[PDB]
C-alpha cells in the first residue's frame, strides 16, 4: 500500500 506519492523509495 503506497498511499502517498513519495512513500515508496
Amino acid at each position: 500500500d503506497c498511499y502517498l506519492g513519495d512513500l515508496c523509495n
Epitope: 500500500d1 503506497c2 498511499y3 502517498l4 506519492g5 513519495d6 512513500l7
Partner: antibody
Framework: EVQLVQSGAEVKKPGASVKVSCKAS????????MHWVRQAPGQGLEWMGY????????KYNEKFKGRVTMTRDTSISTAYMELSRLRSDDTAVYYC???????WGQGTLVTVSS | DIVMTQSPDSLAVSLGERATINCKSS????????????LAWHQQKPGQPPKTLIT???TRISGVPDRFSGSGSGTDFTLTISSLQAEDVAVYYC?????????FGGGTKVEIKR
Amino acid sequence: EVQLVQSGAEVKKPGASVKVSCKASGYTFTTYVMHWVRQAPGQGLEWMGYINPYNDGTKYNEKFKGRVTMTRDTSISTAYMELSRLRSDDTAVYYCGRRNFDYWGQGTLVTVSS
Amino acid sequence: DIVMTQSPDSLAVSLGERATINCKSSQSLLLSGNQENYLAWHQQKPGQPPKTLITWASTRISGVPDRFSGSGSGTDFTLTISSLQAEDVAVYYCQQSYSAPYTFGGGTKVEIKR
C-alpha cells in the same frame, strides 16, 4: 471503527512548548504513518509532518524543521507532536491524521498568549 | 511545493441542486508507476474537525453518501454533489498526497442560495 483520539486543549505562554498526543485504535498502528495538520483560526489547513511508527522515521514540513519533533510509542499506539518556542501565531487547532489523510483526530486547540 | 488552487472560493447552491467544486494543482498528482492520482477531498463544518470524503481522486470513503463523487486526473480534479442537502453546507478542501509538503487547497465554502 478507526478512531484517532487526541489529548485535550492547552493554553501556553510565548516561548513555552506543548506536546500533543494522538491514540489510534481500530487498526494496526504501525501499518500507516501519522501526520500532524494544524489550522490557525479562520485560515486553511497546513501539513506539519508525520512519523512512520514502523521504523520511527519522520518527515517535517520545512516550516517547522527546527521546532517540531514527532514521536511514537508502539506499545500503546500513540503518536506525539511537540512544538517548542511557542509563538502567538502558533495558535491553532492541531489535528492528527492517518495514512493518506483518510481518518482524522478530533483536534487539539492550542492557544498561545501572554 | 505543490500549489493547490480551488474554484470558486464560495459557492451558493439551491437545496437539491448540483454543486461543483474544482481543484487545480501546480503539478501532476498522477504517479506514473501505478497510475494513481494522489488527491483527497475533505469536508469541514464551522468549528468542526475535517472529515474525509474522497481519496485517490475518486474513491469514496466508506459511509459517504452516493451524492458525493470525485473525478479528474493529473492537475484537474472535481468534487461533485449531485443534490445538495442542508447537512452539506460546509467548507470543502482538496489536498494533494503526492509529494511533501502534502498541501491543501484554500477551501470552498458551500452555502444555501436564497
